[PDB]
Amino acid sequence: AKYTREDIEKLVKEENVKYIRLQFTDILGTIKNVEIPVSQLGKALDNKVMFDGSSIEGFVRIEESDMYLYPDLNTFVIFPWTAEKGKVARFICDIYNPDGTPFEGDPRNNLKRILKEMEDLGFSDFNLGPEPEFFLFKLDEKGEPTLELNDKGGYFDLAPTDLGENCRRDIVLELEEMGFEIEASHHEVAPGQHEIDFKYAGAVRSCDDIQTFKLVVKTIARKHGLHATFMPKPLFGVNGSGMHCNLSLFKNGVNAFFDENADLQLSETAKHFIAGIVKHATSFTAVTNPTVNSYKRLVPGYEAPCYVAWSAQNRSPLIRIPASRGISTRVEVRSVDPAANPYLALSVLLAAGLDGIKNKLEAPAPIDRNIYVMSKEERMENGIVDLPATLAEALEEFKSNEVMVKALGEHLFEHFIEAKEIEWDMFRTQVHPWEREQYMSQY
């Protein structure tokens, strides 16, 4: 534990906290919150704050279905931005039906349950270090984003002169006051692109920290007259924002991927784990890669995983086991993007490794070669299958797979497919500016 019920109460009083945000998460990964005044704290902690629970299913909403909000006390946090009357606090919450029981459609409760399937196999932790990237634009007069990037820096440049803006520098400062464990932070490939990297953490613990990131980003961005965005491929020709995910399975406090007594220095647990992330890969991309734009980033060329392979050095090696070992022995999945729902994306990768280990799966050869270099046939001569290329292709892969569907189960799986099918359709039925420049005269 990290906070006593009395611990929360005292902080508020002496801290003039005057407004509570009971935040949680709709299906698309959007940050949701119902807020209440500090005077309704009891009602919150006693888990009796109700709300229209149908907000979780995003835009596919049908009925008004009342539902409960159970605050995780450990999530509790207070923001350095004070109102003109009182500081504000937050509470990451779980959603319960009116019958005291978990709501299956809640992505938070959908990961707590794939973590359990984990325990049903002995493990104690599944740690998670995300490498979440983003872009910062300028805001015009009214307050809209333009497409004027914030800075003209490139890969790892000392890239914004310290005296001045430094949204990156100033975010990483406010994040550390809020009790985050930031590893580093550099300037990514395209001008105006930035990356901040996290210290590992319990899955759901880190997911909570990936919502808090995205939220503190877009806020401080705004504060610097800017506009932060997590769209994967904001612009053609430039880089796309990724969110590599450093994963590892501990057992009784010890990294189960490690073995300084096996080929490649990888426990036979790990090899298996890897095994399954490949089987399902095509079948779980629709979750790690929710949006239409996400696939404009998975075109071979801008260092983005097009190819289902497991190396250590490659141009788009979908899987990458980095240098370090021991405690820090972990698989890297380089194909996620910032838009991926963390809670879900995580449940879907686990369920992947899990069915992998659970069924003892036989891992392929590490294509140490550069995969990119060859033709699709040369790439077919080995186990090189490229990913789904359109949201449709990715959504069909998903449905056809059974282990990814129990990873989300009836409710979640049911509503995701619908929202996404409408989304694609919306995009396909549309006639784009490109089609007119490309056709209106040619035909």
Residues 203-262 close enough to bind its own copies by CB under 8 A: 227, 229-237
Cα–Cα distance, 110 to 113 (Å, whole number) = 5
Q: Which is nearer to its own copies, 176 or 435 (CB)?
A: 435
CA-to-CA distance for 419 and 57, rounded, in angstroms?
8
Strand partners, 132: 243
Backbone angles phi, psi at 2, to 5 degrees: -135, -15
Which string of x and - marks every residue 149-188 that binds ligand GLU (by CB under 6 A)? ---------------------------------------x
Burial class (CB in 10 A: 0-12, 13-18, 19+), 427: middle
* 307 neighbors 379 (Cβ within 8 angstroms): yes
Residue 70 CB, nearest approach to its own copies (Å): 17
Q: Which does 199 bind (CB under 5 to 8 A by kind): its own copies, ligand ADP, ligand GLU, none?
A: ligand ADP
Build a one-symbol-per-residue string for 120-159: x at contacts with its own copies by CB under 8 A, - elsewhere: -----------------x-------x-x----x-------
Does residue 248 have a known ligand-binding role?
yes
Part in contact with ligand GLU (CB under 6 A); list of ranges 39-47, 67-75, 297-305, 421-429: 297-305
Taking CB under 8 A as the criterion, which residues in 168-187 touch its own copies?
none
From the CB of residue 76, how many other CB atoms can be counted at a distance below 10 Å?
18
**Under DSSP, is residue 436 helix (H, G, I), strand (E, B) or coil?**
helix
- Among ligand ADP, its own copies, Mg ion, none, what binds residue 406 when CB lies within 5 to 8 Å by partner kind? none
Told to judge if 131 belongs to the known catalytic residues of this protein, a careful annotator would answer yes
| 158 CB-side CA count, 13 A | 3
Residue 277 interacting partner from its own copies, Mg ion, ligand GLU, none (CB closer than 5 to 8 Å by kind): none
Compose the 118-137 pattern: x for residues touching ligand GLU by CB under 6 A, - for all others. ---------------x----
Q: Which of 125, 209, 259, 332 is catalytic?
A: 332
Would the CA dihedral through 275, 279, 285, 288 be positive or negative? negative
Residue 32's contacts (CB-CB under 8 Å, 6 or more residues apart) are 23, 24, 25, 26, 55, 56
Which does residue 102 touch among its own copies, Mg ion, ligand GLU, none (CB within 5 to 8 A, set by kind)?
none
Per CB under 6 A, the segment of 27-35, 164-172, 238-246, 429-437 that binds ligand GLU is 238-246
Cα–Cα distance measured from residue 268 to residue 364, given in angstroms and rounded to the nearest whole number: 13
What DSSP state is assigned to residue 21? E
Identified binder of ligand GLU from the candidate list 33, 206, 211, 241, rule CB under 6 A: 241
Burial 198-207 (b: 16+ CB within 10 A, else e): bebbebbbbb
> According to CB under 8 A, which residues from 366 to 385 bind its own copies?
none
Ligand-binding site membership of 418 (annotated) = no
Contact between 129 and ligand ADP (CB under 6 A)? yes
Residue that the structure tokens 């209106």 belong to: 440
What does 177-205 look like in DSSP terms, one character per residue? Answer: HTT--EEEEEE-SSTTEEEEEEPP-BHHH
Q: Which of 7, 59, 322, 436 binds ligand ADP (CB under 6 A)?
A: 322
Q: Which of 334, 379, 415, 420 binds ligand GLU (CB under 6 A)?
A: 334
Q: Answer yes or no: are the C-beta atoms of 302 and 363 closer than 8 Å.
A: no
Between 108 and 244, CB nearer to Mg ion: 244
Q: Give the chain's length.
A: 443
CB 25 within 8 A of CB 108: yes
With binding defined as CB under 6 A, does residue 303 bind ligand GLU? Answer: yes
Show the tokens assigned to 419.
Answer: 């929202």
The DSSP secondary-structure symbol of 363 reads -
Question: Is 411 noted as a catalytic residue in this protein?
Answer: no
Q: Which stretch binds ligand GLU (CB under 6 A): 235-243, 285-293, 340-348, 419-427?
A: 235-243
E strands within 215-311?
Answer: 226-229, 243-251, 254-255, 307-311
Tell me how far apart the alpha carbons of residues 441 and 264 are, in angstroms, rounded to a whole number. Answer: 58
Residue 428 interacting with its own copies (CB under 8 A):
yes
**Number of Cβ within a 10 Å radius of residue 46:** 11
Q: How many CB atoms lie within 10 A of CB 395?
A: 21
Q: Of 3 and 439, which has the nearer Cβ to its own copies?
A: 439
Q: How far apart are CA 215 and CA 174, in angstroms?
A: 12
- 188, 209, 259, 397: the catalytic one is 188
Q: Which residues are catalytic?
A: 52, 131, 133, 188, 195, 244, 315, 332, 334
Q: Please report, as ranges, the residues that interact with ligand GLU according to CB under 6 A.
A: 133, 188-189, 239-242, 297, 302-305, 334
From the annotation, which residues make up the binding site? 131, 133, 183, 188, 195, 239-240, 244, 248, 297, 303, 315, 320, 332, 334
Q: Please report, as ranges, the residues that interact with its own copies according to CB under 8 A.
A: 30, 50, 62-66, 98, 137, 145, 147, 152, 227, 229-237, 291-293, 295-296, 299, 313-315, 320, 322-324, 338-339, 389-390, 392, 427-436, 438-443
From the annotation, which residues make up the binding site for ATP? 183, 248, 315, 320
